[PDB]
RNA sequence: ACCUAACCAGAAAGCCACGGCUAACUACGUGCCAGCAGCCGCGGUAAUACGUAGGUGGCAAGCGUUGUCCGGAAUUAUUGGGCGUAAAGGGCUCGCAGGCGGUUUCUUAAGUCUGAUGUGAAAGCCCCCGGCUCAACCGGGGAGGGUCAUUGGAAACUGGGGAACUUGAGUGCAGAAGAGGAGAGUGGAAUUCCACGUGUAGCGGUGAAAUGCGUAGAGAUGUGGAGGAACACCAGUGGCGAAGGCGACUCUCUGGUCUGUAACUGACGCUGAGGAGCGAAAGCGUGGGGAGCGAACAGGAUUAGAUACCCUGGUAGUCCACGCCGUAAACGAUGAGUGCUAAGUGUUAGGGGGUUUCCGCCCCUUAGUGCUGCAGCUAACGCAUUAAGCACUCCGCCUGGGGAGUACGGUCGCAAGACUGAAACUCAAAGGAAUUGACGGGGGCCCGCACAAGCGGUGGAGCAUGUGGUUUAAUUCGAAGCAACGCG
RNA sequence: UUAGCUAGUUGGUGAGGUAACGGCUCACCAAGGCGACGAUGCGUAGCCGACCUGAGAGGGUGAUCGGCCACACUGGGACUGA
């Protein structure tokens, strides 16, 4: 680029896309607008419990089923660890991470939140899985 | 020129011994490929390697190819004369002249290379390409193109230490 | 065309910096003048004698790089480029090469060199760049 | 708060990681299930990757996950990237604005640089000390931060102004050359068709045929006429043009290029977003022209199928004039201008010359163009005085692929569409060069009961053995292209 | 993928007004003015000392302390007073 070609047409810019949706709200009191506040983890009231096919190669049972969060979207989100007191009609809080297998999970509903619960029968790590101290003696 | 003798105490750091398969008849025929470069430990550093069946084969081939070649590195006390950027082989590296306790922060092959050449403080941050021989090439023609004051000034008749500071 | 004189002069002087020629020519002008009198008494080349007649020109300089290959012309770099210009303060000149070369900032009171405009103290138009 | 005495080690340690990146390893269970995961990717009965247990490693009253910002990111590049093939040269030109500019000389300070004052408050960043037991912190003493004003200098460089000069560029003078263009006219060779002679049973086409034509007299051959389109030989990696492109011959009107001294002018130049203009072939409108060729279409062939290849026909179109279309592998996948940098060998268009009336050889010289190659460039192929080398001026383009040149919006178009031109989602690959092998119904060379050349068989008949299958209480297991089947 | 905008607008004269010049507001006159050096229009947003990050150039935020502007349920209005 020439000095005159770059000094009177300027530089294109280097915009990237956003990790995940989470806006911020939308806070509909009233706009319903409304974002972007871009919070660290939505929590939402959740859709439906199930297990989808993982990605090629590999050939497991992924259980991950869709939230309708607390601002308005609806991405379906794999939840973290083995069993779950998550049902139908129970709330979770999403947390980021993109999945790897199933293509779409746009969270990972953290197994240790208010409506979830936590890892059961697990001390290895309970940071995630949020299984609470060891057992006793 | 001059081609200096194996006359010193070798260091032989291994840069990467990587793989090789030649596709033929049968599969892979795999063989070991590994570009470790040799070190006097005062300024004779020089880094080719060649390949063998064995890991130690690839080391043998390696002494061998520093017993080949190896360079000279004038600088002056944990410096180089002239910082230049020196890259030969679409591989830069910005190699500037560092004080006395700045330590020799280079990279993968600039660390081995400097790192095993007698380097006090040389700051080197890399532009350019990645592979391990493409990173010893450029480095090592950048080492091999750096000017001493000494003999910058016995060449360019000026005055010897007229350019000071 | 004609875009700028020192940089014809410089990649004159580097073309045949590279060629191995004995002499080099030059568009005689008062920036190949004092810079061939600059770069002259520096101690690159051996000897410019500006042979002059009409109507314009004509330096003539000659190499001063023996045997060993690159002498004291070992490599030159338009500084200032003449389209988007060069500029230091007295503070802010900057000695090219670190020890080995040497920088040609044309000062307000003659083309001076690097460590001589830094002896004046008075920087001005980067001229040229000889590492 | 802090001090003093007593008391008790008594109450005071967890979180993450242990393949790589990355410090940190083994066992049990699980057996593509449950799972992990930042990327690479693991997990289908020996998991250093899933959980569990010991141990190790990082860190510490904290440790991980996620959200956002910076760096890595030379992955917007002024520092500091590029465009022949990877993404990227505008199809090409003319030009306004803008950006840049030959040498000498006087002035100027508008930029450039420097000194003095003002001001850039404090707190904060950095340097130098002191105070809270030290530290975080506080306080004091400094610094640095401006196209900043006002003002004093230098005039080197860019610019303002005046004087100049000539190679740049232009005019002149004389040469040379060409399918450069526009209009008019003319000429043949060949095909078709028509008229008549001559003559018979085929002509035609193909891989092989058929459709088609021919006893209404074809093909062929002789003569003559009509009409359209393109001009063979010269003709050649020749010439000219900005490019697309341009070929029979002649004339009118016209542009441009190069050579040569050198009369004049004295920088009057280079690029140039918009804007203007041209741009193959297909198309589009009207009106002409339709001999050959010929999408769509018809028939026959080849194939399992033939909305194709082939053949026989055949509309639009090709042609012309007037207007619109404005795309192409519009290619040298290389923008224009300028300066320099090894050589050889062609080839047109000129010039100077060495003797040469000649002619002709040879050198020097331009300009244009082709090959072969030094330095140098590069990822490799390759380029290389016609650079992709070496530097300067300016314009245009490029920022992973798909989505997608798609949608939506505008401009133009009679339309056909052209220009401009996104996004959501998704993936860790697309891509360029080079290597090794494979393949080929690619070519080259060769060999063998491979083929050809002969003998005698098998597949037909009854029987012997094995296999498949069906049956069984079981018809034991193993072999399944040659290499399983008179096999173990 | 905003090329149009503007009519108290551009400018004059005159009068009134406020602490004060001023189309600040009106009468009369003229037809101006801004724009590729981006007008207008959509969008977003308090700005700065500074903070965080980077080797540096730069990139991001305007918390807490301070400086200025704005607002005080929404939208106008004027009185008291310096």
Same mark, same amino acid.
């Given at each position: 680029?020439?000095?005159?070609?770059?000094?009177?047409?300027?530089?294109?810019?280097?915009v990237?896309?956003?990790?995940?949706?989470a806006?911020?709200?939308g806070y509909?009191?009233?706009?319903?607008?409304?974002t972007?506040?871009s919070?660290?983890?939505?929590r939402?009231?959740?859709?439906?419990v199930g297990?989808?096919?993982?990605?090629?190669p590999?050939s497991?049972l992924?259980?991950?089923?869709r939230v309708?969060?607390?601002?308005?979207?609806?991405?379906?989100a794999?939840?973290?660890?083995?069993?779950?007191?998550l049902?139908?009609?129970?709330?979770?809080?999403?947390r980021?991470?993109?999945?790897?297998?199933?293509?779409?999970?746009?969270?990972?509903?953290?197994?240790g939140?208010?409506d979830?619960?936590?890892?059961?029968?697990r001390?290895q790590?309970?940071?995630?899985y949020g299984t609470?101290?060891?057992?006793?003696? | 020129?001059?081609?200096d003798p194996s006359?010193?105490?070798?260091?032989?750091?291994?840069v990467?011994?990587?793989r090789?398969?030649?596709?033929?008849?049968?599969?892979?025929?795999?063989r070991f490929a590994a570009?470790?470069v040799?070190?006097?430990?005062?300024?004779?550093?020089?880094f080719?390697?060649?390949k063998?069946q064995?890991?130690?084969?690839?080391?043998?081939?390696?002494?061998?190819?520093?017993?080949?070649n190896?360079?000279?590195?004038?600088?002056?006390g944990?410096?180089?004369?002239h910082?230049?950027?020196?890259?030969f082989?679409?591989?830069n590296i910005?190699?500037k002249?560092?004080?006395?306790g700045?330590?020799?922060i280079?990279?993968?092959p600039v660390?081995?290379?400097?790192?095993?050449?007698?380097?006090?403080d040389?700051?080197?941050?890399?532009?350019?390409?990645?592979?391990?021989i493409?990173?010893?090439?450029?480095?090592?023609?950048?080492?091999?193109?750096?000017?001493?004051?000494?003999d910058v000034?016995?060449?360019?008749?000026?005055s010897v230490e007229?350019?000071?500071? | 065309?004609m875009?700028?004189?020192?940089a014809?002069?410089?990649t004159r002087?580097?073309?045949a910096n590279?060629?191995?020629?004995?002499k080099? /020519?030059?568009?005689?002008?008062?920036?190949?003048?004092? %810079?061939?009198?600059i #770069? $002259?008494?520096e101690?690159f080349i051996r000897? +410019? /004698?500006?042979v002059?007649?009409?109507?314009?020109g004509? %330096?003539?300089?000659? #190499? $001063?790089?023996?045997?060993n290959?690159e002498? +004291?012309?070992?490599?030159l770099?338009?500084?200032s480029?003449?389209?988007?210009?060069?500029?230091?303060?007295?503070?802010?000149?900057?000695? +090219?090469?670190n020890?080995?070369?040497i920088?040609?900032?044309?000062t307000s009171?003659?083309?001076?060199?690097?460590?001589?405009?830094?002896?004046?103290?008075?920087?001005?138009?980067?001229?040229?760049?000889?590492?």
């Open positions: 680029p020439t000095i005159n070609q770059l000094i009177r047409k300027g530089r294109v810019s280097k990237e896309n956003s990790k995940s949706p806006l911020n709200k509909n009191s009233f706009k319903k607008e409304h972007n506040v919070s660290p983890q939505k939402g009231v959740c859709t439906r297990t989808m096919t993982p990605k090629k590999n497991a992924r259980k991950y089923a309708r969060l607390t601002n308005g979207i609806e991405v379906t794999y939840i973290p660890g083995i069993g779950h007191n049902q139908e009609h129970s709330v979770v809080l999403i980021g991470g993109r999945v790897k297998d199933l293509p779409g999970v746009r969270y990972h509903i953290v197994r939140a208010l979830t619960a936590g890892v059961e029968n001390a790590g309970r940071s995630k609470k101290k060891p057992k006793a003696k | 020129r001059r081609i006359k010193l105490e070798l260091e032989e750091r291994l990467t011994v990587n090789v398969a030649k596709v033929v008849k049968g599969g892979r025929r795999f570009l470790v040799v070190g006097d430990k005062n300024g004779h550093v020089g080719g390697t060649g063998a064995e890991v130690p084969e690839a080391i043998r081939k390696a002494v061998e190819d520093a017993k080949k190896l360079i000279e590195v004038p600088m002056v944990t410096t180089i004369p910082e230049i950027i020196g890259r082989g679409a591989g910005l190699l002249p560092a004080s006395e700045t330590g020799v280079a990279g993968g660390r081995a290379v400097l790192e095993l050449a007698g380097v006090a040389i700051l080197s941050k890399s532009l350019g390409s990645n592979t391990p493409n990173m010893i090439r450029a480095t090592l023609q950048g080492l091999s193109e750096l000017k001493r004051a000494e000034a016995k060449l360019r008749g000026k007229e350019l000071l500071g | 065309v875009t700028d004189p020192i014809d002069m410089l002087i580097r073309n590279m060629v191995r020629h004995e080099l /020519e030059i568009p005689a002008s008062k920036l190949k003048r004092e %810079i061939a009198e #770069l $002259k008494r101690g000897d +410019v /004698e500006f002059e007649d009409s109507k314009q004509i %330096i003539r300089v000659f #190499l $001063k790089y023996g045997q290959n002498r +004291v012309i070992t490599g770099k338009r500084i480029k003449p389209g988007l210009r060069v500029y230091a303060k007295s503070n802010e000149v900057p000695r +090219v090469l020890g080995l070369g920088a040609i900032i044309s009171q003659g083309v001076l060199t690097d460590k001589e405009a830094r002896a004046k103290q008075a920087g001005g138009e980067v001229l040229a760049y000889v590492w």
